[PDB]
Amino acid sequence: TKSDAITQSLRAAVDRNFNDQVAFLQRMVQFRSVRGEEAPQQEWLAQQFADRGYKVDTFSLADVDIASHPKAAPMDTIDPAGSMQVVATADSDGKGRSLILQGHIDVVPEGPVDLWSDPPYEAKVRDGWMIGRGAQDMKGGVSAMIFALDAIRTAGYAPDARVHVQTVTEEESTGNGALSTLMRGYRADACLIPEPTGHTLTRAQVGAVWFRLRVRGTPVHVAYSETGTSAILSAMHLIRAFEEYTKELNAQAVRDPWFGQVKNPIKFNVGIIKGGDWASSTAAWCELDCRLGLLTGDTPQEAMRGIEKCLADAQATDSFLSENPAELVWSGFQADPAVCEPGGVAEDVLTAAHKAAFNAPLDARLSTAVNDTRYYSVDYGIPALCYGPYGQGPHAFDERIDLESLRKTTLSIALFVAEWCGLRKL
Amino acid sequence: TKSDAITQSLRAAVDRNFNDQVAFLQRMVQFRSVRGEEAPQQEWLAQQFADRGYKVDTFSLADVDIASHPKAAPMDTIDPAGSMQVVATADSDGKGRSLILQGHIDVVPEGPVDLWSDPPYEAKVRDGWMIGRGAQDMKGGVSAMIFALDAIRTAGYAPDARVHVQTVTEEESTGNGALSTLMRGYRADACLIPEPTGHTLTRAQVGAVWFRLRVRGTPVHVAYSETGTSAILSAMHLIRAFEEYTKELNAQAVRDPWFGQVKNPIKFNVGIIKGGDWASSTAAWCELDCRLGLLTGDTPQEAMRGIEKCLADAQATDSFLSENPAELVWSGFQADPAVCEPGGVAEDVLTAAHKAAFNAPLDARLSTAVNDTRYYSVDYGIPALCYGPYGQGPHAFDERIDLESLRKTTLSIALFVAEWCGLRKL
Ligand SMILES: [Zn+2]
Ligand SMILES: [Zn+2]
Ligand SMILES: [Zn+2]
Ligand SMILES: [Zn+2]
């Protein structure tokens, strides 16, 4: 009765504030916070936190000397001094369990704007969905965690333990934002990141390596092409080589504890290609930006050695590459895989919070995408939960988030905070 | 003999003026007259022609309504109103045969500047060679044609017939600059273009078609790669299809009366590639700029239909393309092949000039590259000769011209003009 009344009041608070929440998310989605362009979104979030009475700490990857940590990933052409993190702290003298709530506010490129059916940064709301780049992955989740805490406040309460609310860059490229919050000093008894898991807990997740191949060739006139080579055709040779390696890796994936019975869990992608200068000249250069997954039994340095070996073996079978060996650039992720070890108390609390919010059991799922919980649990021994709202089209056209999923997910997170941290009268 | 005397005075004249010729050529090479950026080079040439007493006509592709000609080729992103031609005319009441001397002053992109051993637009001279983009192809030949006429003047003569000296853009991409000189009204009893043929007459030359393939595909999270498709992988499928088609075309090439015994005379090249947005997103787009040659019995229209069919056939067999057909864009050349039929009087005169200058018989060769002689002969019935100096590396790193060759070729052209046009004493 005591317990049901507090729950029914948080539910009330979440509904009361929900119209504001959707507006809040729309504003976020309208920030085109692609890589390198996140500062305005973070400035806004900082002021939003200030408005709610949090102590606010904003700092860059350079402020914590990011490259000094062995798990920091290389930053390619992006200046670490411009890559901004925001951590809001509600301090407390309470006896409950402290919590980190974290989400990323970087979003992946929208792609060809003409292929979206509603514009990617307008945040059009339609038939109970909001369409936008970042709406699902993961600004929706970010709105859910902030408003979970607003709901507790609206209901007349405050968490009975220290809480940090973290908004980070670089999740989609390195993970260095998440890592920097830990380098900066922030700890808690648990961490929850509301990636768009469709109301599931991510039980295990792959890691990943980003790498760029820079290929040369011997340019000649097309008329004399046999006397030269093409860097673009040689790049294609390497793509085929990496595809074969990836098939070999997936044949071995059956030995993995968690992903053993999943079909082709290791994914290889050539995401960006550029090369050549002239339709009637042999291409002298070609660059490929790639990604390769790794499983729970692998480390990134093992996967990097494997990548180097695959490339070394493939250079020998191409004439242009025997005279012009391709350069390998570590261009981003060197990311650990992670497991949410079953049987933890944090998961028990989320199970009960989920039950109350969705009137269903909490399902666990595998993920062939990376997420930032890995830093919290692998590197800092913090129980970490990846769990969030439902939507469609991450990294795709017409990415969209289910607004009723979001309401329920916001409630679930609020209920989680209440049990995990405990409540006190505001 | 009297003809031997005139030849010796022309030999002396070319030698006297050669240091000036080299400085003139260096200045030309120092103009980075890549496509769209040729106007300063043309403004300088116009003035150099005015300084020599020629009547000078400069006009753009727009000024002749280029697109109105059936042999005009598409201009892609390049504004015809800014593509400048220069035609210098030396009128005569003489009874000799009139002559066009023509060269292109557009140069192909230099490619990775760090892979040149001497910078591409510095025109360094070392060990009897000049290194530079355009030095061989074909600013060298332009200097030769200009200084051949300067030698005739130095020796105390003028050509005894009308001469037009033409410098044009667009040879490396469409041929529209050459065609515009003819649409403007310029005619003569013969035309000579000093492409760097290594002191050979080009007997026959391929045509060519430029085309761009614009792919789509369905972008997803690499994590769910199989859910979607890669536009990059689909572009590769098309490249393979065009390579197979080119193979079939070369199988049929045995029936060409000029190229029938050449191995692989038809060349396919993918010169430029761009695609995708993100290492961890499936590529939604990919664009390829290509070139395909065609042989002397083929027409550009027929080649174009063949390219369209090859593409149509290949769309069927790719998943992403089966639902997202790639678009073909005509991107430049729609260039006729050409033949310099043997037995012509112009060739006889060139043969004599060549023997006098080089003490060697004139060899004739086949070319697997297009040149602008096609318009003069095919479209306007003007006997046209492609013949010029020796170098190395057209469209390649460290393009260079042999200065001893340049000097002798300049004499050869002077001797050709003297006999073709006749000479009168100043
Ligand atoms: Zn995410
Ligand atoms: Zn993502
Ligand atoms: Zn040329
Ligand atoms: Zn050329």
Q: What is the three-state SS of chain B?
A: CHHHHHHHHHHHHHHHHHHHHHHHHHHHHCCCCECCCCHHHHHHHHHHHHHCCCEEEEEECHHHCHHHCCCCCCCCCCCHHHCEEEEEEECCCCCCCCEEEEEECCECCCCCHHHCCCCCCCCEEECCEEECCCHHHHHHHHHHHHHHHHHHHHCCEEECCCEEEEEECCCCCCCHHHHHHHHCCCCCCCEEECCCCCCCEEEEECEEEEEEEEEECCCCEHHHHHHCCCHHHHHHHHHHHHHHHHHHHHHHHHHCCCCCCCCCCCCEEEEEEEEECCCCECCCEEEEEEEEEECCCCCHHHHHHHHHHHHHHHHCCCHHHHHCCCEEEEEEEEECCEECCCCCHHHHHHHHHHHHHHCCCCCEEEECCCCCHHHHHHHCCCCEEECCCCEECCCCCCCEEEHHHHHHHHHHHHHHHHHHHCEEEC
Is A239's Cβ below 8 Å from some Cβ in B? yes
Interchain CB distance below 8 Å, B272 and A276: yes
Task: Please name which of B113, B201, B199 lies closest in space to residue B402, comparing C-alpha atoms.
Answer: B199
| Residue B104 marked in a binding site | yes
Are B273 and A286 within 8 A, CB to CB? yes
DSSP state of A224: G
Q: Count of CB contacts below 8 A, A vs B? A: 202
Residue A287 known to bind ligand: no
> Quick one: which of A337, A322, A347, A323 has its CA closest to A265?
A337
- Does A395 carry a binding-site annotation? yes
Residue of A nearest to B276 (CA): A272
**B239 and A239 in contact by Cβ < 8 A?**
no
CB contact under 8 Å between A280 and B272, yes or no, is no
Residue A239 contacts residue A369 (beta carbons within 8 Å): no
**Closest ligand to residue A221's CA:** 4
Does A270 sit within 8 Å of B291, measured CB to CB?
Answer: no
* CA B327 – CA B283 distance, rounded (Å): 16
Phi, psi for B420 (deg, rounded to 5): -70, -50
Q: By CA distance, what is A213's nearest residue in B? A: B279
**Chain A residue with Cα closest to B283:** A271
| A-chain residues near B109 (CB < 8 A) | 277-278, 281
Solved how? X-ray
Q: Rounded to whole angstroms, how far apart are CA atoms B238 and B268? A: 12
Q: Is A391 in the B-facing interface, judged by CB distances under 8 Å?
A: no
Q: Alpha-carbon distance B327 to B96, whole Å?
A: 53
Q: How far B317 CA lies from chain A's nearest CA (Å)?
A: 18
Region of B284 on the Ramachandran plot (φ > 0 left; ψ -120 to 50 alpha; else beta) = alpha
Contacts of B278 in chain A (CB under 8 A): 108-109, 172, 271-272, 289, 395
Task: Please report which helix (H) or strand (E) contains residue A268, including its range.
Answer: strand A268-276
Instruction: Mark which residues 304-323 of B lie under 8 Å from A by CB.
Output: none
Q: Does B392 touch chain A (CB under 8 A)?
A: no
C-alpha–C-alpha distance, residues B240 and A24, integer Å: 49
Which amino acid is it at A131?
I
Residue B249 C-alpha to ligand 1 middle, in angstroms? 50
The beta strand positions in A39-136, using DSSP E, are 55-60, 84-90, 99-104, 125-126, 129-131
Other CB atoms within 10 A of residue A13 CB: 23
The answer for B 242-271 residues in CB contact with A (under 8 A) is: 264, 267, 269-271
Q: List chain A residues with CB under 8 Å of B332.
A: 279
DSSP run (H or E) holding A215: strand A207-216
Both tokens assigned to A342: 């079953």
- Note whether B105 contacts A: Cβ–Cβ < 8 A: no
Q: A1-206+335-426 belongs to which homologous superfamily?
A: Zn peptidases (3.40.630.10)
Q: Which two tokens stand for residue B62?
A: 């727009």
CA nearest B83: which of B118, B39, B122?
A: B39
List where CATH 3.40.630.10 sits in chain B: 1-206+335-426
Residue with tokens 């190229």: B259
Q: Is B219 in contact with A395 (Cβ distance < 8 A)?
A: yes
SS3 A43: helix
Rounded to whole angstroms, the Cα distance separating A85 from A79 reads 14
Question: A5 at the B interface (CB within 8 A)?
Answer: no
User: Domain A207-334, what fold?
Assistant: Alpha-Beta Plaits (3.30.70)
Residue B331 in contact with partner chain A when CB distance is under 8 A: yes
The alpha-carbon gap from A230 to the nearest alpha carbon of chain B, in Å, equals 8
Q: Of the candidates A293, A332, A374, A387, which has an alpha carbon nearest to the alpha carbon of residue A170?
A: A332
By C-alpha distance, which of B415, B414, B416 is closest to B346? B416
| Of A175, A133, A41, A31, the residue nearest A392 (C-alpha) | A133
The experimental resolution of this structure, in angstroms, equals: 1.9
Q: What is the CA radius of gyration of chain A?
A: 23
Q: Inter-chain contact A111–B277, Cβ cutoff 8 Å?
A: yes
Residue of chain A whose alpha carbon sits nearest to that of B268: A222
What is the Cα–Cα distance from B86 to B31, expressed in whole angstroms?
A: 16
Query: How far is ligand 4, taken at its centre, from the CA of residue B293, in Å?
Result: 14
Euclidean distance between CA atoms A21 and A8, whole angstroms: 19
Residue A281: list chain B partners with CB under 8 A.
108-109, 111, 269, 271, 395-396
Spacing, Cα A127 to ligand 2 middle (Å): 24
Of all residues in chain A, the one with the smallest CA distance to B275 is A273
Closest CA to B328 of B189, B222, B209, B230: B209
Residue A363, SS3 per DSSP: coil
Distance CA B418, CA B10 (A): 9
In sequence order, the 6+-apart residues with CB closer than 8 A to the CB of A265 are: A206, A250, A253, A256, A259, A293, A295, A366, A368
Instruction: Select from A119, A122, A167, A146 the least CA-distant residue to A26.
Output: A122
Report CA(B210)–ligand 4 centroid distance (Å).
Answer: 14
**How does strand B201-205 pair with strand B285-294?**
unpaired
Q: Could you give the CA distance from residue A149 to residue B296 in angstroms, rounded to a whole number? A: 77
Closest residue, chain A, to B227 (C-alpha):
A393
What's the CA-to-centroid distance between B195 and ligand 3, angstroms?
Answer: 5
Q: Could you give the angle at the alpha carbon of B101 between the alpha carbons of B99 and B105, nearest 5°?
A: 160
CA distance B282 to chain A (A): 6
Q: What angle do CA B348, B350, B356 make, to 5 degrees?
A: 105
- Å from CA of A172 to ligand 2 middle: 5
Q: Which DSSP letter does residue A256 get?
A: S
**Spatial contact of A149 and A163, defined as CB atoms under 8 Å apart:** yes
* CB contact residues (below 8 A), chain B span 131-190, against chain A: 172-173
Token pair 């006997």 is found at B383
> Angle at Cα A250 formed by Cα A245 and Cα A254, nearest 5°?
145
Contacts of A275 in chain B (CB under 8 A): 272-273
Annotated binding residue B172: yes
Q: How far is CA A86 from CA A53, A167, A193, B243, B399, in A?
A: 14, 5, 15, 53, 54
Nearest to B172 by CA among B25, B339, B400, B371: B371
A68: helix, coil or strand? helix
d(CA B18, CA B414): 13
For residue B171, the CA-to-ligand 3 centroid distance in Å is 7
Contacts of B213 (CB under 8 A, 6+ apart): B235, B238, B287, B288, B290, B311, B326, B327, B328, B329
| Chain A interface disruption, residue of B104, B107, B269, B277, most A CBs within 10 A | B269
Residue B354 annotated in ligand binding: no
Please list the alpha-helical segments (H only) found in A279-329: 300-315, 319-323
With beta carbons under 8 A apart, name residues in chain A contacting B242: none
Listed in sequence order, the residues at least 6 apart from B288 whose beta carbon sits closer than 8 Å to its beta carbon are: B212, B213, B215, B235, B238, B239, B270, B272, B273
Cβ <8 Å between A281 and B331: no
What is the Cα–Cα distance from A371 to B351, expressed in whole angstroms?
75
- B413 vs chain A: nearest CA distance in angstroms? 26
Judged by a CB distance cut-off of 8 A, whether residue A281 touches chain B is yes
**How far apart (Å, rounded) are the C-alpha atoms in residues A213 and B325?**
29
- Residue B110 to chain A, least CA–CA distance (Å): 8
- Asked if B210 lies within 8 A of A271 by C-beta distance, the reply is no
C-beta atoms of A271 and B270 within 8 A:
no
Nearest ligand to residue A371 Cα = 1
B237 is in an annotated binding site: no
Radius of gyration of chain B (CA): 23
**CATH 3.30.70.360 domain range(s) in chain A:** 207-334
CB-CB contact of B371 with B171 (8 Å): yes
